[PDB]
A = this chain, B = another copy of it.
Amino acid sequence: KDNVLTEEEKAEGYTLLFNGKDFTGWKMFNGGDVKGWQVEDGVIVGYGADTTIKVSTDIVTVKNYHNFQIKWDWKIGAQGNSGFLYHVQEGPKYKAPFETGPEYQLIDDDNYPWVSETGKEGLEDWQKTGCNYAMYVPETKQVNPPGEWNSSMVLYKDGYVEHWLNGEKLFSFQEGSEDWKMRRYSGKWEAFPDYGISTTGKLCFQDHGSKVYFKNVKIKDLD
């Protein structure tokens, strides 16, 4: 059942973005073949040397995408921080995919060790799972705790974006909109002038904390 298209998914035009067995279709951000992640038991596992050099361990698609609809299943560890990013650009100008590609946050909402300015522990709600990081936050959502599987989906079609989680539409927005522009250009991206620099780019899974697990990664390449 895992990593297999249903007849209805094939009918809708989904194909496997992860084949269940290896990293065919994937590469390291700013790198070559995938390392520091493994396929184990039909699951992509991210682990997050006579060497001290530290480079991005995030994985990106080889293929560039414009419009798409992607579904995936995911599991994090306690205190995990991962994410799905889209329209990511690579190059020596960048150290990380978040500098260019918008992020669907995958994080330990309740127990990620973030201590605020004032000495208050805990992520703010706009930094939690299913948010379009530093742009949009759901009013309500349902997330299974760390160690349990979750299902997510992102649709992008000519700037129209939807975030879904565990069967529910969290929100949608339009990149063209006045509201989007306000959030983009007066929110938190001063240091990242290339954030959303392009509506075409790579798709990406990140690991910045603990182990993370992905499977059932199915994609509709849209017109």
Which residues of B lie under 8 Å from residue A136 when comparing CB positions? 179, 182
Contact present for B139 and A177 (CB under 8 Å): yes
Stretch from A9-17, A42-50, A185-193, A202-210 contacting the other chain: A185-193
Q: Which residue of B lies closest to A178 (CB)?
A: B137
Which residues of B lie under 8 Å from residue A185 when comparing CB positions? 124
In addition to A126-B182, A186-B187, 4 A-B residue pairs with Cβ atoms within 8 Å of each other are: A125-B182, A126-B178, A126-B186, A137-B178
Q: Which of A173-199 contact B (CB under 8 A)?
A: 177-179, 181-182, 185-188
- With an 8 Å Cβ cutoff, the count of chain A residues facing the other chain is 17
Which residues of B lie under 8 Å from residue A182 when comparing CB positions? 124-126, 136-137
Max chain B C-beta neighbours (<10 A), residue from A134, A137, A139, A182: A182
Distance (whole angstroms) from the CB of A4 to the closest CB of chain B: 36
Q: Which residue of B lies closest to A126 (CB)?
A: B182
Q: Which of A121-148 contact B (CB under 8 A)?
A: 124-126, 134, 136-139
Closest 6 CB pairs of A and B: A126-B182, A137-B178, A137-B182, A139-B178, A125-B178, A186-B187
Whole-angstrom CA separation of A187 from B124 in the bound complex = 13
A-B contact pairs, 23 of them (CB 8 A): A124-B181, A124-B185, A124-B186, A125-B178, A125-B181, A125-B182, A126-B178, A126-B181, A126-B182, A126-B186, A134-B186, A136-B179, A136-B182, A137-B178, A137-B179, A137-B181, A137-B182, A138-B178, A139-B177, A139-B179, A186-B187, A186-B188, A187-B187
Q: Which residue of B lies closest to A125 (CB)?
A: B178
Whole-angstrom CA separation of A46 from B188 in the bound complex = 36
Whole-angstrom CA separation of A138 from B179 in the bound complex = 7
Whole-angstrom CA separation of A179 from B140 in the bound complex = 11
Q: Which residue of B lies closest to A190 (CB)?
A: B117
Distance (whole angstroms) from the CB of A16 to the closest CB of chain B: 34
Whole-angstrom CA separation of A181 from B188 in the bound complex = 15
Distance (whole angstroms) from the CB of A130 to the closest CB of chain B: 11
Whole-angstrom CA separation of A139 from B125 in the bound complex = 25
